[PDB]
XYZ file of C-alpha atoms in Angstrom:
393
model
C -7.657 8.690 -29.388
C -8.444 7.517 -25.749
C -4.853 7.885 -24.593
C -4.357 11.231 -26.311
C -7.540 12.617 -24.605
C -6.285 11.069 -21.378
C -2.910 12.870 -21.693
C -4.910 16.052 -22.717
C -6.648 15.696 -19.347
C -3.402 15.575 -17.246
C -1.714 18.415 -19.226
C -4.696 20.648 -18.360
C -4.862 19.416 -14.681
C -1.270 20.628 -14.161
C -1.878 23.770 -16.330
C -4.944 24.673 -14.140
C -2.742 24.160 -10.982
C -5.094 21.362 -9.877
C -2.348 18.622 -9.492
C 1.441 19.142 -8.854
C 2.269 16.392 -11.373
C 1.669 12.680 -12.054
C 3.684 9.697 -13.335
C 1.655 7.209 -15.474
C 3.072 3.779 -16.124
C 1.599 0.764 -17.926
C 3.314 -2.489 -18.808
C 2.087 -5.787 -20.192
C 3.567 -9.317 -20.135
C 4.425 -9.569 -23.922
C 6.411 -6.322 -24.136
C 3.868 -4.752 -26.571
C 2.709 -2.209 -23.944
C 5.365 0.006 -22.283
C 3.563 3.239 -21.488
C 5.493 5.744 -19.399
C 4.399 9.409 -19.169
C 5.798 12.228 -16.925
C 3.611 15.230 -16.134
C 4.435 18.424 -14.247
C 6.750 19.276 -11.354
C 7.619 17.061 -8.317
C 7.129 19.877 -5.748
C 4.793 22.916 -5.572
C 7.668 24.761 -3.691
C 9.705 26.801 -6.165
C 13.467 26.032 -6.234
C 16.481 28.371 -5.712
C 16.565 29.211 -9.479
C 12.758 30.042 -9.302
C 11.954 27.015 -11.533
C 9.867 23.911 -10.637
C 11.747 20.584 -10.746
C 9.796 18.029 -12.854
C 8.227 14.824 -11.626
C 10.297 12.204 -13.465
C 10.236 8.347 -13.586
C 13.479 8.426 -11.582
C 11.911 10.656 -8.816
C 11.996 9.181 -5.230
C 8.448 9.327 -3.782
C 6.970 8.654 -0.355
C 5.154 5.355 -0.954
C 3.329 5.277 2.422
C 0.839 2.336 2.442
C 2.327 1.261 -0.995
C 5.286 -0.252 0.948
C 2.986 -3.125 2.195
C 3.254 -4.835 -1.187
C 7.113 -4.855 -0.863
C 6.928 -6.200 2.725
C 4.423 -8.942 1.696
C 6.955 -9.859 -1.040
C 9.738 -9.998 1.629
C 7.561 -12.177 4.060
C 6.676 -14.551 1.221
C 10.400 -14.844 0.215
C 11.132 -16.057 3.841
C 8.242 -18.498 3.578
C 9.586 -19.525 0.099
C 13.052 -20.187 1.768
C 11.417 -22.310 4.501
C 12.069 -19.801 7.267
C 8.284 -19.609 7.972
C 5.249 -21.698 7.299
C 2.296 -19.511 6.187
C -0.118 -21.237 8.582
C 2.392 -21.712 11.439
C 1.998 -19.730 14.671
C 4.116 -16.506 14.796
C 4.890 -17.566 18.493
C 8.599 -18.395 17.829
C 9.436 -15.161 15.781
C 6.866 -12.698 17.195
C 6.601 -13.642 20.975
C 5.788 -9.985 21.638
C 2.734 -9.911 19.378
C 1.668 -13.258 20.908
C 1.847 -11.820 24.453
C -0.551 -8.942 23.544
C -3.977 -8.742 25.194
C -7.230 -7.816 23.457
C -9.079 -4.573 24.339
C -12.685 -5.483 25.247
C -13.350 -1.854 26.205
C -13.383 0.169 29.429
C -15.129 -0.004 32.806
C -17.162 2.713 34.629
C -13.902 3.943 36.333
C -12.492 4.505 32.802
C -9.930 1.678 33.340
C -9.199 -0.629 30.333
C -10.761 -4.110 30.142
C -8.245 -6.613 28.664
C -8.378 -10.307 27.721
C -6.077 -13.167 26.573
C -6.363 -13.651 22.798
C -8.129 -16.804 21.598
C -6.599 -18.567 18.602
C -3.242 -18.297 16.883
C -1.638 -15.743 14.599
C -0.029 -16.894 11.302
C 1.777 -14.834 8.657
C -1.542 -15.153 6.683
C -3.569 -13.436 9.438
C -0.847 -10.746 9.362
C -0.697 -10.442 5.512
C -4.490 -10.520 5.098
C -5.442 -8.099 7.954
C -7.236 -10.823 9.939
C -4.600 -10.795 12.782
C -6.948 -8.892 15.072
C -4.705 -5.786 14.971
C -6.047 -2.337 13.944
C -4.355 1.084 13.563
C -4.879 3.302 16.604
C -6.833 5.972 14.610
C -9.028 3.436 12.712
C -10.466 1.884 15.921
C -12.816 3.675 18.430
C -11.539 1.724 21.488
C -7.857 2.142 20.414
C -8.486 5.908 19.892
C -9.975 6.034 23.431
C -7.087 3.977 24.797
C -4.523 6.391 23.261
C -6.055 9.707 24.479
C -6.491 8.483 28.084
C -2.731 7.686 27.775
C -2.481 3.933 28.240
C 0.669 3.448 26.107
C 2.564 5.240 28.930
C 3.875 1.907 30.273
C 5.504 0.939 26.904
C 8.579 3.023 27.816
C 9.493 0.552 30.669
C 9.610 -2.592 28.467
C 11.239 -0.862 25.522
C 8.052 -1.581 23.502
C 8.013 0.547 20.362
C 4.951 2.851 20.185
C 4.204 1.459 16.622
C 3.847 -2.098 18.140
C 2.682 -0.983 21.646
C -1.175 -1.021 21.044
C -3.343 -4.046 21.962
C -5.428 -6.356 19.761
C -9.002 -5.214 19.013
C -10.314 -8.706 18.134
C -9.235 -12.436 17.958
C -7.303 -13.634 14.846
C -9.584 -14.382 11.868
C -12.616 -12.860 13.618
C -12.826 -9.882 11.168
C -11.036 -7.798 8.453
C -9.516 -4.724 10.147
C -6.940 -2.542 8.365
C -4.082 -2.669 10.863
C -0.397 -3.013 11.723
C -0.266 -6.645 10.436
C 2.321 -5.818 7.782
C 4.657 -3.808 10.062
C 4.653 -6.938 12.352
C 5.362 -9.189 9.299
C 8.365 -6.884 8.576
C 9.546 -7.635 12.178
C 9.317 -11.401 11.487
C 11.420 -10.997 8.226
C 14.114 -9.067 10.227
C 13.930 -11.734 12.987
C 14.068 -14.709 10.591
C 16.938 -13.494 8.476
C 18.832 -11.481 11.112
C 18.915 -8.650 8.475
C 17.253 -5.245 8.758
C 14.477 -4.485 6.249
C 16.709 -1.939 4.502
C 19.519 -4.520 3.952
C 17.064 -7.354 3.208
C 15.101 -5.108 0.702
C 18.363 -4.337 -1.114
C 19.659 -7.956 -1.281
C 16.260 -9.576 -2.087
C 14.140 -6.987 -3.877
C 16.404 -4.218 -5.240
C 19.478 -6.160 -6.388
C 17.586 -8.961 -8.376
C 15.501 -6.450 -10.414
C 18.410 -4.032 -10.776
C 16.954 -1.328 -8.511
C 18.676 1.821 -7.115
C 15.720 4.247 -6.512
C 14.198 2.158 -3.627
C 15.023 2.508 0.110
C 13.787 2.636 3.733
C 16.703 4.910 4.900
C 16.473 7.766 2.315
C 18.694 10.127 4.473
C 21.679 7.725 3.916
C 21.276 8.238 0.107
C 22.057 11.994 -0.499
C 22.253 10.934 -4.178
C 18.490 10.063 -4.050
C 17.639 12.726 -1.400
C 18.586 15.730 -3.591
C 16.331 14.301 -6.392
C 13.213 13.642 -4.259
C 9.667 14.933 -4.661
C 8.254 17.088 -1.870
C 4.805 16.434 -0.398
C 1.935 18.577 -1.703
C -1.343 19.074 0.191
C -4.741 20.211 -1.152
C -6.409 23.039 0.867
C -9.677 21.696 2.319
C -10.590 25.400 1.949
C -9.678 26.813 -1.547
C -8.621 23.570 -3.212
C -5.202 25.174 -3.849
C -1.906 23.215 -3.456
C 0.555 23.717 -0.577
C 4.051 22.649 0.396
C 4.109 20.272 3.449
C 7.298 19.348 5.534
C 6.315 16.452 7.880
C 12.522 0.596 9.854
C 8.848 -0.543 9.602
C 7.437 -2.772 6.856
C 4.001 -1.143 6.528
C 5.006 2.395 5.392
C 8.755 3.437 5.543
C 9.645 3.078 1.812
C 10.828 5.781 -0.641
C 10.769 4.616 -4.297
C 10.766 6.256 -7.761
C 7.646 5.448 -9.900
C 9.743 3.369 -12.355
C 11.466 1.297 -9.610
C 8.024 0.323 -8.170
C 6.794 -0.619 -11.682
C 9.873 -2.981 -12.100
C 8.469 -4.892 -9.004
C 4.890 -5.170 -10.471
C 6.162 -6.048 -13.923
C 8.132 -9.000 -12.429
C 4.893 -10.102 -10.622
C 2.855 -9.814 -13.913
C 5.495 -11.550 -16.161
C 5.834 -14.465 -13.628
C 9.609 -14.185 -14.222
C 10.406 -15.927 -10.898
C 12.946 -13.143 -10.123
C 11.279 -12.004 -6.870
C 8.941 -14.903 -5.994
C 8.189 -18.351 -7.436
C 5.299 -17.994 -9.966
C 3.242 -20.434 -7.827
C 3.824 -18.177 -4.774
C 2.699 -15.157 -6.853
C -0.491 -17.104 -7.960
C -1.181 -17.616 -4.175
C -0.982 -13.808 -3.617
C -3.850 -13.214 -6.100
C -5.990 -15.909 -4.402
C -8.933 -14.375 -2.413
C -7.632 -15.311 1.073
C -10.835 -14.352 3.002
C -13.368 -16.801 4.517
C -17.001 -16.090 3.244
C -18.085 -14.578 6.641
C -15.075 -12.219 6.453
C -15.441 -11.610 2.687
C -19.009 -10.346 3.458
C -17.909 -8.339 6.602
C -15.049 -6.670 4.606
C -17.337 -5.585 1.722
C -20.095 -4.503 4.183
C -17.530 -2.215 5.930
C -15.848 -1.030 2.695
C -19.183 -0.129 1.012
C -20.149 1.688 4.281
C -16.761 3.549 4.478
C -16.562 5.975 1.451
C -14.756 8.429 3.771
C -11.864 5.864 3.950
C -12.262 4.391 0.377
C -9.572 1.624 0.278
C -10.213 1.146 -3.488
C -9.713 4.701 -4.737
C -10.372 4.692 -8.538
C -12.406 1.483 -7.923
C -16.271 1.535 -7.890
C -17.593 2.627 -4.429
C -19.840 -0.490 -4.183
C -18.441 -3.808 -5.525
C -17.620 -7.490 -4.690
C -14.036 -7.649 -3.365
C -11.836 -9.980 -1.304
C -8.314 -9.603 0.049
C -5.204 -11.656 -0.798
C -1.588 -11.413 0.258
C -0.527 -7.878 -0.762
C -3.840 -6.268 -1.673
C -7.561 -6.225 -2.525
C -8.930 -8.632 -5.191
C -11.714 -7.703 -7.676
C -14.262 -10.500 -7.431
C -15.965 -9.006 -10.456
C -15.032 -7.163 -13.664
C -14.983 -3.380 -12.980
C -16.459 -2.386 -16.384
C -16.609 -5.747 -18.154
C -14.007 -5.655 -20.943
C -13.604 -1.805 -21.014
C -11.559 -1.780 -17.725
C -10.077 -3.895 -14.811
C -11.034 -7.580 -14.526
C -11.934 -10.258 -11.944
C -8.924 -11.397 -9.923
C -7.218 -7.990 -10.337
C -5.241 -7.302 -7.123
C -4.560 -3.650 -6.147
C -3.552 -1.285 -3.363
C -2.735 2.328 -2.739
C -0.540 4.805 -0.964
C -1.548 7.907 1.015
C -0.268 10.576 -1.477
C -2.746 9.323 -4.141
C -0.418 6.403 -5.167
C -2.357 3.539 -6.829
C -1.032 0.307 -8.402
C -2.800 -2.796 -9.751
C -1.946 -6.102 -11.422
C -4.573 -7.505 -13.776
C -3.359 -11.081 -14.529
C -6.566 -11.951 -16.548
C -5.975 -8.994 -18.889
C -2.175 -9.323 -18.555
C -1.663 -5.706 -17.490
C -0.164 -3.715 -14.654
C -0.420 0.028 -14.081
C 0.723 2.675 -11.588
C -0.206 6.222 -10.909
C 2.331 8.080 -8.861
C 1.219 11.315 -7.270
C 2.892 13.119 -4.322
C -0.348 14.715 -3.251
C -2.269 14.410 0.075
C -5.037 13.847 1.276
C -5.921 10.345 -0.008
C -8.879 9.763 -2.415
C -8.629 13.359 -3.759
C -11.477 13.712 -6.387
C -9.141 15.219 -9.065
C -6.581 12.383 -8.678
C -9.275 9.658 -8.424
C -10.999 10.849 -11.666
C -7.624 11.243 -13.435
C -6.607 7.679 -12.377
C -9.999 6.242 -13.466
C -9.284 7.959 -16.868
C -5.666 6.702 -17.275
C -6.446 3.009 -16.621
C -9.626 3.133 -18.725
C -7.744 4.848 -21.644
C -4.909 2.239 -21.420
C -7.328 -0.766 -21.343
C -9.008 0.856 -24.386
C -5.674 1.099 -26.406
C -4.466 -2.401 -25.426
C -7.782 -4.077 -26.408
C -8.193 -2.525 -29.941
C -4.405 -2.588 -30.508
């Protein structure tokens, strides 16, 4: 009954040309629950035979911000192998990040005001967004810094634009969604002497038996020919449109199923990717009370951003290594529980791991912009329907 009505919903969301397609996956520890449903086409662009290729479980998707879980997993594997201490200064491996000044602001003459950072950066600061780094667009000062063209000097030191911006605050001063994970990816490459693509294969893909996961998609024509195209929703008519647009924070292309294999491993506590104890640490609310409050105050005040997605707009959350932790049950028993870690991806990608309930789910969409009402409501419905079936069943 709940699941059927939930599938009824998707079938009619694709029928109505509201969503290009969606991949719904749900797995539990025990093996009882293995839900996998494939709706619609992968692209809104009609093919050469005037058909619409379906969105299948084997379909390579642009993960975007969903890649940060995979990088976190890589960074923790290095830590697990004694290549890094979680609360050790990045100084040795990331001397570049450690050289970085902090943007105070600008003077009357428009010139930037910089300062030496106070306090050290650890992989934890990085993994928990407390590093002091932002994303250029997310920060007012950084946005101002970028338009007045201050990253013009980068060229002469070979500094990569991605890692060229300064710090906005001191480490552990506040929760800022930033380039912390892309920098952690750098550390992994620098600790192992392996590029993220090679490392991801060896350490993430190979142990779970994964093919449909890569950073360098172009080098896999096998996977390229089978990939989903990005769909955008007209801010104007709400119609769908075709859109043709080695960093740890975003670069990954993965099929829905291949991503699930990762999560399932994490849920099961199989020890395949990370030591179960190391996984338990990921789900720990990493934030200091001051920062736990600051984060929620900002998140409640930022519905335009909405880091939660399907999640209630106003709620008690903290952050751990790899995602946002529910510090309260979302709808008591009926849905997601306390200690549920989750994160998203730009094209309406949303994953979660509910250890308390013993469930993990993913909704794969290849549809921009983020937090799309249709997608959000559909996701809310899928999880809720699943939790309903699992509980009575």
